[PDB]
Design a protein around this ligand. Structure first.
Ligand SMILES: *[C@@H]1O[C@H](CO)[C@@H](O[C@@H]2O[C@H](CO)[C@@H](O)[C@H](O)[C@H]2NC(C)=O)[C@H](O)[C@H]1NC(C)=O
Ligand SMILES: *[C@@H]1O[C@H](CO)[C@@H](O)[C@H](O)[C@H]1NC(C)=O
Ligand SMILES: *[C@@H]1O[C@H](CO)[C@@H](O)[C@H](O)[C@H]1NC(C)=O
Ligand SMILES: *[C@@H]1O[C@H](CO)[C@@H](O)[C@H](O)[C@H]1NC(C)=O
Ligand SMILES: *[C@@H]1O[C@H](CO)[C@@H](O)[C@H](O)[C@H]1NC(C)=O
Ligand SMILES: *[C@@H]1O[C@H](CO)[C@@H](O)[C@H](O)[C@H]1NC(C)=O
Ligand SMILES: *[C@@H]1O[C@H](CO)[C@@H](O)[C@H](O)[C@H]1NC(C)=O
Ligand SMILES: *[C@@H]1O[C@H](CO)[C@@H](O)[C@H](O)[C@H]1NC(C)=O
Lengths: 220, 364, 346, 50, 198
């Protein structure tokens, strides 16, 4: 495949909890994507996998709707449990049980199932996957991007979507491909302290890092 | 409040007034099913330590008074909550973890402990809010030839994350020479059997352990204990029990744009400002009931026993009434004169004990 | 940093330097006098209508009684400071209807009856420039009950038992005191501060003021129009300086900001756990039995009591500083306004 | 110590107001020295004849 | 060899900041004030500095206190000798007697000893089992070391709050003294004062 590099451009902030806060500045320490970091761009025209390190961050600008899955795990071929989804116009059902995957995918508990609206609704698909204390957390948010060149400017907070009850230790992950091309951005989370700004409607409109440059430390 | 039988001429701040609540409201989500503690606490066998079984208890009504009848244990030892208060408040989800350990190793099932179970078999988080139950199984899990159906793991390369399960069966190597699948020199099996016998001492008897882990209210609550609901009323000073949150205040219909994943709204001083009703999806605003300090304006007890009451900083429709800028004055008559200040009250208003029958008057 | 421009004054044993002309200069000295009067209710702040916390609070002695005594002493002291500074005149003097004081234009400092609150132009500029924090001495509880948009900081201060008492003297009464002092200064001179007021023309009063500082009185009478024009241009320069520069009134803005941030810190200290399991008393009282909740409530009571004692101590030290400044302002009112001062740089 | 810092974080904002008090004293000392000594606009010099 | 007092103060987080004005700048300010007082008189404190002979300035200083100015001009050498002898007496008194500067030394000494106490209070136990934090972490498990750490944190916070309150009170006293010194510099150096015993 093809590997390139991109700056983050202050994107990847989310709601830290499920409490409504309005017109306040809140300082939270959590696994966040640091501002102006190195995000690896992957073009999948050709597939070895990627290491999982304290959660990841996925971005996609694919208008053609050819991304229909995320695969997690440790060894990726049976044994330990590997997440697998099916995305179409009908269901978003979750498969945790083993299948004995191949090299190019184009006996435990926690067999989650979920029938709901499709995840994939000039569009930006953002995702955050993290794992703390056996709890697996998913975050997602649509973004109607107009200037389709790179990761755009602004602050789009990510809605918390799915929390799993329990999971196995995860060190590796893959990405599905659709054939009858694909490009995704991968970033890595780090434990950081953020200062989030809430407007009168309770939405996160701005955020200041506390470890980027000394002006931001002074603002924190 | 002055600890004296005579007071002097002046204004004294005595206490505060507060409208008492008149009704009690308990709002719980509508739910019919009962939680199956009988399957957890009464089973023909329990899983091993290295492969502990977790059951997700949700969408039911949890009664904790039947746990004592199900199993003959001594102490319902908890860490974040109290055993007697578990039928009042309620949680989001319950997780029951069941295993059988040795009697010498029951003290390792606690937050912030090390050892052998707490390092390689079953590790609890430091912020653990839940209860641990252990009871004897000498008549169910002990054989005179040795019970060999229970295994524990003691050899591992690293520590264990909290609530991490490991069922891998690989031959442990503690040297440079590889085992290559043969348990030869410096090659060990990480799983060993307990070998329970009834002739052992009381410290080596098998104890069945069930760990009930609760998680706090951050989602819509779907498992709750038995409490009767009450019809909701608004614009009244009431006591409320919203999913275990007990408080006093008035509930108002509010236009707050709650996101669909959010359930609560907090203030600057970490006080709950807005709630979501559990039965119907409505947003309610909590405001504390009407209050204010009370000042007593009097001359000396040597002069008279008459007093005037200043209600501080209230437009007093919620108690001679005179509305000043520093509250309202009851018991003093306003006059259209101007004397020097005798007893100061507020923004340009002074009170004095004058004839013009003697009475307490207020003026500018 | 540069200490200043280098100068080498030419000194000799038979050489002197004598001025031939003068300037009339109007400066501005801004002095704090009083600060915000606050009152704290311990039962609502530490406990908040919790009966168990009230039962464990009466076993701590008489800490809140002496805290309320200290805050009441500060609140009385602020009104005493304002009365000591401003209420030095015994009557209320009024300027004559004819506005001719030798050519000196006092139209910008004397009040006008068009507006309801009788304040002058410069007083209006000084009142508009120092923005207030809008403390809850006005009866704001009707607005606090009917909450709109997000909750304000003042409503959160009021709901935790932290209130602000209004001062005894309103701004109209201070304006009346200032107008009486100005009328007695420009119609009588220094005689109204040492007995009855004695009328005198303003040109003769300025001749007395020049004769006080060693300059003979014929200098004024031969240069009256120039001195009047210099005074009027100085008043125009000071209204333009107050209209342009907003950093001159930093002392009163600091007085407002310190008493705002002390109450903000006192409110924000309620979220701290202080070593307990939660910062909310009802969650502790519901999640625990009697003894464990008693221990956690004891921890929270000790932490909140320590924070309140720190607030009261810092308020006492600030009150001492404000009282020293108010005594200095009272001395400056007694000496600069009610008479002429021979002290250098006073 | 990391554990001591984590338990100190629960005690609130005492250190912020203590640092604010010490910073206020520190700037007040320089204000005192400036208002005592810096009372002249120009730095004069004595003539060479004494 | 032995650890110094300043090193032990600095190793625990107590840092002494330098003043903004160096002693050369204070000496230049004092030299400017002395040159303006000797040459000009009181005229440099109320506008532009105007030169005057020192004998005529001293004649006006005599005329201020009610002595006719011919007294100076008929007794100029005697007054000059008396001033020179008084300056030499001040020189000898400062060279021999050292207890006259006991105020400023106290301003040093308190600001030493308070910091010294703030070091000594690190040795106290405050009801715990040890004053060393690493021994508490080494000997004890999670909850018990949390209790001991909470006791030590409460004790150290109480001692540090006491230090800050004492520093605030001393700052108020020093500010009052500095206001008095500023008034004396404005009224004695820059003019002639009619206030008695001032
Ligand atoms: C003393 O100074 C004043 C200014 O403060 C001089 O007044 C100015 O005189 C000039 C003469 O050409 C006029 O153009 C200005 O308008 C005057 N200024 C003001 C404010 O009136 C005055 O002339 C000086 N005295 C002497 C003797 O020169
Ligand atoms: C990201 O890392 C690569 C590694 O070689 C580097 O070349 C590139 O400049 C980095 N991107 C930045 C610093 O924006
Ligand atoms: C809050 O929402 C309203 C309605 O959508 C909108 O008019 C307003 O601009 C929003 N406020 C913001 C974005 O600060
Ligand atoms: C609970 O109440 C809501 C609204 O009152 C209703 O829509 C829902 O069907 C009820 N559920 C049950 C199980 O009764
Ligand atoms: C446990 O379950 C068995 C099987 O149904 C039953 O016979 C027994 O009475 C149960 N014991 C208790 C204490 O519920
Ligand atoms: C609140 O007090 C003001 C004071 O004059 C009064 O005008 C107003 O009517 C009051 N509001 C009420 C009674 O609702
Ligand atoms: C006066 O000044 C001149 C010039 O410096 C000098 O020569 C003369 O000696 C001085 N007079 C006396 C008496 O010293
Ligand atoms: C000066 O006095 C006159 C009265 O004759 C007045 O009209 C004018 O406004 C005054 N000047 C200013 C700047 O107020």
């Amino acid at each position: 495949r093809t590997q390139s590099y991109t700056n983050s451009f202050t994107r990847g902030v989310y709601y830290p909890d499920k409490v409504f806060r309005s017109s306040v500045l809140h300082s939270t320490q959590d696994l966040f994507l640091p501002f102006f970091s190195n995000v690896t761009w992957f073009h999948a025209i050709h597939n070895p996998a990627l290491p999982f390190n304290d959660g990841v961050y996925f971005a996609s600008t694919e208008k053609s709707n050819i991304i229909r899955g995320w695969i997690f795990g440790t060894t990726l071929d049976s044994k330990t449990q590997s997440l697998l989804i099916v995305n179409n116009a009908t269901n978003v059902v979750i498969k945790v049980c083993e299948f004995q995957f191949c090299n190019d995918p184009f006996a435990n508990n926690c067999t989650f199932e979920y029938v709901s609206q499709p995840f994939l609704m000039k569009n930006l698909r953002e995702f955050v996957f993290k794992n703390i204390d056996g709890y697996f957390k998913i975050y997602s948010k649509h973004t109607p991007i107009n200037l389709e060149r790179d990761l755009p400017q602004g602050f789009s907070a990510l809605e918390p979507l799915v929390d799993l009850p329990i999971g196995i230790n995860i060190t590796r992950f893959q990405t599905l491909l659709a054939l009858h091309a694909a490009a995704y951005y991968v970033g890595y989370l780090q434990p950081r302290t953020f200062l989030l700004k809430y407007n009168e409607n309770g939405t996160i409109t701005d955020a200041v890092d506390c470890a980027l440059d000394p002006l931001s430390e002074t603002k924190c | 409040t002055l600890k004296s039988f005579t007071v002097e001429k002046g204004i004294y701040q005595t206490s505060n007034f507060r409208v008492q609540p008149t009704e009690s409201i308990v709002r719980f989500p509508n739910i019919t099913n009962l939680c199956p503690f009988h399957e957890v606490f009464n089973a023909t066998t329990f899983a091993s330590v290295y492969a502990w079984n977790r059951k997700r208890i949700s969408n039911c009504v949890a009664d904790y008074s039947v746990i004592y009848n199900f199993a003959p244990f001594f102490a319902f030892k908890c860490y974040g909550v109290s055993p007697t208060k578990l039928n009042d408040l309620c949680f989001t989800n319950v997780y029951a973890d069941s295993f059988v350990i040795r009697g010498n190793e029951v003290s390792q099932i606690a937050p912030g402990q090390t050892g052998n179970i707490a390092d390689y078999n079953y590790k609890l988080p430091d912020d653990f809010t839940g209860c641990v139950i252990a009871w004897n199984s000498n008549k169910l899990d002990s054989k005179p030839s040795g019970n060999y159906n229970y295994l524990y793991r003691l050899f591992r390369k690293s520590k264990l994350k909290p609530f991490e399960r490991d069922i891998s069966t690989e031959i442990y190597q503690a040297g440079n020479k590889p085992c290559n699948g043969v348990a030869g020199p410096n090659c060990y099996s990480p799983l060993q059997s307990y070998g329970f016998r009834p002739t052992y001492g009381v410290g080596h008897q098998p104890y069945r352990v069930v760990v009930l882990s609760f998680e706090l209210l951050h989602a819509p609550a779907t498992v709750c204990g038995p409490k009767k609901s009450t019809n909701l009323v608004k614009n009244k000073c009431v006591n409320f029990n919203f999913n275990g949150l007990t408080g006093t205040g008035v509930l108002t219909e509010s236009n707050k744009k709650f996101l669909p994943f959010q359930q609560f709204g907090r203030d600057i001083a970490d006080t709950t400002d807005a709630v979501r009703d559990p039965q119907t999806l409505e947003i309610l605003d909590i405001t504390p009931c009407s209050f204010g300090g009370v000042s007593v304006i009097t001359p000396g007890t040597n002069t008279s026993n008459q007093v005037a009451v200043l209600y501080q900083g209230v437009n007093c429709t919620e108690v001679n009434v005179f509305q000043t800028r520093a509250g309202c004055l009851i018991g003093a008559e306003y006059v259209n004169n101007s004397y020097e200040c005798d007893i100061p009250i507020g923004a340009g208003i002074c009170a004095s004990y004058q004839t013009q029958s003697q009475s307490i008057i207020a003026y500018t | 940093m540069s200490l200043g421009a280098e100068n080498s004054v030419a000194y000799s044993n038979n050489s002197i330097a004598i001025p031939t002309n003068f300037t009339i200069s109007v400066t501005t000295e801004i002095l704090p006098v009083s600060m915000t009067k606050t009152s704290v209710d311990c039962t609502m702040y530490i406990c908040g209508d919790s009966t168990e916390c009230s039962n464990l609070l009466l076993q701590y002695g008489s800490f809140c009684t002496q805290l309320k005594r200290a805050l009441t002493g500060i609140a009385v002291e602020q009104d005493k400071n304002t009365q000591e500074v401003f209420a030095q005149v015994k009557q209320i003097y009024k300027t004559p209807p004819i506005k001719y004081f030798g050519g000196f234009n006092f139209s910008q400092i004397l009040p006008d009856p068009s507006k309801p609150s009788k304040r002058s132009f410069i007083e209006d500029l000084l009142f508009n420039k120092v923005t207030l924090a809008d403390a809850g001495f006005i009866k704001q509880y009707g607005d606090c009950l009917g909450d709109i948009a997000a909750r304000d900081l003042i409503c959160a201060q009021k709901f935790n038992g932290l209130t602000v008492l209004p001062p005894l003297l309103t701004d109209e009464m201070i304006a009346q005191y200032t107008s009486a002092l100005l009328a007695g200064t420009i119609t009588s001179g220094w005689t109204f501060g040492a007995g009855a007021a004695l009328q005198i023309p303003f040109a003769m009063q300025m001749a007395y003021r020049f004769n006080g500082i060693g300059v003979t009185q014929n200098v004024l009478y031969e240069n009256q129009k120039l001195i009047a024009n210099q005074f009027n241009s100085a008043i125009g320069k000071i209204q333009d300086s107050l209209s342009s520069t907003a950093s001159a009134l930093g002392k009163l803005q600091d007085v407002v900001n310190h008493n705002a941030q002390a109450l903000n810190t006192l409110v924000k200290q309620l979220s701290s756990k202080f070593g307990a399991i939660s910062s909310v008393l009802n969650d502790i009282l519901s999640r625990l039995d009697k003894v464990e909740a008693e221990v956690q409530i004891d921890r929270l009571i000790t932490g909140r009591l320590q924070s309140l004692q720190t607030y009261v101590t810092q308020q006492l030290i600030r009150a001492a500083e404000i009282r020293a400044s108010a005594n200095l302002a009272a001395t400056k009112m007694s000496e600069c306004v009610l008479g002429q001062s021979k002290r250098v740089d006073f």
